[PDB]
Ligand binder design. Sequence first.
Ligand SMILES: Nc1ncnc2c1ncn2[C@@H]1O[C@H](COP(=O)(O)OP(=O)(O)O)[C@@H](O)[C@H]1O
Ligand SMILES: [Mg+2]
Lengths: 308, 208, 215, 220, 220
Amino acid sequence: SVIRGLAAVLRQSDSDISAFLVTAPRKYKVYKIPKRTTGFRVIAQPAKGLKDIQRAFVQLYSLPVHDASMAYMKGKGIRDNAAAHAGNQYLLKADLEDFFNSITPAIFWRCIEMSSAQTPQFEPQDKLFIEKILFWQPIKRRKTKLILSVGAPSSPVISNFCMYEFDNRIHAACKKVEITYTRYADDLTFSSNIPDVLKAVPSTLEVLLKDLFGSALRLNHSKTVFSSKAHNRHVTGITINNEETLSLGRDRKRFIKHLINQYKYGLLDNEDKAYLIGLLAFASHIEPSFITRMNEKYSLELMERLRG
Amino acid sequence: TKQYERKAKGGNLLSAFELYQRNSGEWFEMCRDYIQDGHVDESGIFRPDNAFYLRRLTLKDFRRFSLLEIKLEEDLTVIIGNNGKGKTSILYAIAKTLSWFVANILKEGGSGQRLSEMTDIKNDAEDRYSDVSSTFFFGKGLKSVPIRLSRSALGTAERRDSEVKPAKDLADIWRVINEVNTINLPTFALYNVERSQPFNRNIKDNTG
Amino acid sequence: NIWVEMITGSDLVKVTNDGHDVTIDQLSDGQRVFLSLVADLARRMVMLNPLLENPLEGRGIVLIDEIELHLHPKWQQEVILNLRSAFPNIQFIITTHSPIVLSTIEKRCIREFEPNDDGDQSFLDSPDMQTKGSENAQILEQVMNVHSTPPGIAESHWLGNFELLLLDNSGELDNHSQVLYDQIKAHFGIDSIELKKADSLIRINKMKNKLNKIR
Amino acid sequence: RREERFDAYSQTLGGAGRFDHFVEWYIYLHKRTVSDISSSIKELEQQVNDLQRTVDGGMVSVKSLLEQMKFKLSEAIERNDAAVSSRVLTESVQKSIVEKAICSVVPSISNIWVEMITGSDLVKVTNDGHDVTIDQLSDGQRVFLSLVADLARRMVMLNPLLENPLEGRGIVLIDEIELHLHPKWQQEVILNLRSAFPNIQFIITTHSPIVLSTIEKRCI
Amino acid sequence: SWFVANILKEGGSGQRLSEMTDIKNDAEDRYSDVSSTFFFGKGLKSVPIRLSRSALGTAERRDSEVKPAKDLADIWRVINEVNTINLPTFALYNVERSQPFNRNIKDNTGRREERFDAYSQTLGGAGRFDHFVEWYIYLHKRTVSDISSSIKELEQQVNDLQRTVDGGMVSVKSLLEQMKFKLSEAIERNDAAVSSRVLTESVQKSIVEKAICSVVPSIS
RNA sequence: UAGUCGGGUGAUUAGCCAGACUCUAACUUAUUGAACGUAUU
Ligand SMILES: Nc1ncnc2c1ncn2[C@@H]1O[C@H](COP(=O)(O)OP(=O)(O)O)[C@@H](O)[C@H]1O
Ligand SMILES: [Mg+2]
């Protein structure tokens, strides 16, 4: 049935879809992306044919996603995520280890079985095809090891779904004690105005993860960080200032001003100029007041010239 | 790359070093100045602009500890408790972590020490593995150097990996910059109860 | 002072210890062990900091277990101060069982285990009391959770018992209170703090009783 | 060699004791307590008798084996007789005495026993309510355990005729009694030692006011 | 040493250059290299090996390149495991070979009989003439004895013991099991010896005697 | 005190000025994929 649906969407024969899917878990290009400090991340992108199938699958089958899930959601982003926590003085950040590569077919099917909200029902015959659509085989020789890849277009949807029940439980638990909770992919954020309530959250998380996923998904204990208005607070790259307003941060603002000053004297190269323009669009989205200030500081004419 | 250039010009040491390695003057001097710059305070004591110290330590299923976090002072931290509270365990955990800096200052890709699979995993831990996680500070240009040493208990079929690359990356800066132009290097030492020993002048070590 | 002699025909390191010239082999274990620590540390810093005017102002992390090992109380009062003076940019991470050592350190530097821990405590914390400049007996009780007087010795309770007897007999020395008084005097001596406290109790209680009778 | 009575004098005045000798001796005592020797003699006697009957029945090939078994039997009887001849305490009693001493004197230790783990004999201890190996003990606990265990071993070996062998005579020298001990243990250590070993003359050195608070000035 | 190590064990390590003694004192590059090229027929005209070592604190490490030697040694090891082949001899005889002889010689532990004892201490500098004497005496004893007679004798003893257990003497069952184990071990050793295609002890002895007498002029 | 937030100045990722904050307690991250902003259409 999954095959018939895909064939219809992609205007292909059932036979050619089925044939393609036989080796689909191996149809991934592996490459490296430089980290911002030193080193590399390894990424696996599906081949074009497989990407099309994956997108078709996601289109055909709507999986439930909790409102606390901020990543990969239409009309939501890092701004919304940060804004959720801006009014609270105390902050806790937690992180899940090897999040995407921890999600296996076993976890996926368990989540389907367990799910409260209306999950699509799949015929047993379709389960094998679904696994081949959604999961990557990193090791050629080991056909048994299938995992989600961050690089696949279906992986965001599947990962959010797999966290649905987790999000339900923890969100409900936090709401009872007046803690705000959001998740951006593998990044968990908790905030509150009550002192000495966030300390219990890490223990609660560990128990819940064990309950739902056993040993498959774990907290990165090194990445658990407490913060307050005594210290720097940021959520997904956005600084929350002490006036409870979203900010780019002083250093980034100073850097942007530097680039504008360079532009004013015709010192910016084309690459840097393009960079500056892009960054200003982001600044306009997070902190529009900053753009107003730059207009005041640098002449509206200069800024318009830049953005033209 | 332009991204590294921006970060490096912002004072990021790792970016400056990456640019130095790819082009191999400007960037070399940035790295060397980051390590060597400092000033003499009012008391006449030299103070490095970029201090190096252990900020935080986390122990998971290590010896007596199920999950323990310690925040350390930049200058002096004293740990107190009754016998058997794990004071020596804490020092051992730190010393093993520091061994990774020492090994890599001596030799590119050098190996530090390891947690014991016989003794170091907590006896009644349901997950049969242990983690020692440290974070080091080296000035505003390198605020966080995270290291994890891990070990699985002897029978266990899953094996838990250590994460030591950040230690190696920082130690590489010290080693490489020193080779080109001499710099001051950090001292790491452990003095445990084994420091009490009989003296024999007669015995001379002929190794190095 | 420390120096090398070769004239005997073998190389000997000698030291002036308490005004006497001795060999290293003749030092007490406490002196030798402490000398060893400092000598080793200084050597390494000199070798690793060739471009500093004072190489002992170099960077590093030094771990010392049981800093008070083999040290007389007199030395325990100096040891942390001396080390920090000599090595001002080293991060020291130390363990100790010595209240005397703690009396020389700020409370912010101290990390204390909870008394009935069982290895499930999440975060270590500093004591409530300020230790630096405090009396050793207070540190024993308030930080180390140990009585300043040994509870397992009967004589440690005699003053308490004496006071209770005095209060049971309306403040007058009865036969029983007199016996115990004599025991205190015999055991601790005529010039003891304990006897002075007993004397004080007698004086105060007699005067309180006189006031009560006047009323 | 660890079972020989005068092994009790082996590096007694060397300064460290021999805690390694204790562990060997203690495991030995455990193995002998699980294995009765006279039943082995009775079993060996029965085997010798069965083998003798086979040799008498014309099977000359097993004569070499009979001679070996007779030798083993004679050795077992001799050991039994030597044990009988030594008037020495039973291995079970020896074990119990030492265990009690250790648990009484060393505060963190409530129990000590021998486990067969995999194919090797291992001493285990209940330390602060948790079961651990000797190698897992803290330095302070181990050092003090070592002292008491060694001393108890030697006293048991040298005083076989006493109901309580730890009430034997002797002179014991201890340098820096407070070595590695927290203040709480310093308040109990002298009392515990003197209670366990009542007829030993102790000559000790200390830097601890806490230790001195438990001792009369005449002893100082 | 790298060939020998890998013939003996998969992943075996040979010896390494010293950072202290092997690097030239005034080397500008602050590393040392020992490069060798071996020949093994026209099918493998070049087997290169490099042993390297860098000074402490150099910016780059100099590692040894040993893979070709390991690959070749692996062929010898693996093929030999399946079907016995002849193996190469490596030996160093330094001036240390001039040493006095211990007249008193060790009882046959049984390590000297094992084929890969031939690689023991082969590059140490002195040889092992003590091992020769032990091995040669062993060879003599086996030549004067018969092999399999012990098995036949053991077979006869196990048969006699089996008859005794079948006759109702259950006490000797433990001894039967021990003897069956000894018999199985003897057969296995015999079979392993048979499987290893090793020359008869008599022939081995003859070859060596002839070699010695041929090469050493004073010895007939 | 210190650290943090950051409105201003400053050929400007620096420095300096101003104001404020303090649960034991931020360490600024990753693409070509996904989502979001802007441009293009
Ligand atoms: N693997 C282990 N599992 C559980 N407890 C352990 C383990 N290893 C050691 N311990 C316990 O930890 C304590 C060791 O204390 P130690 O680290 O030496 O601290 P201290 O120096 O303060 O005594 C003892 O109580 C010992 O029983
Ligand atoms: Mg992009």
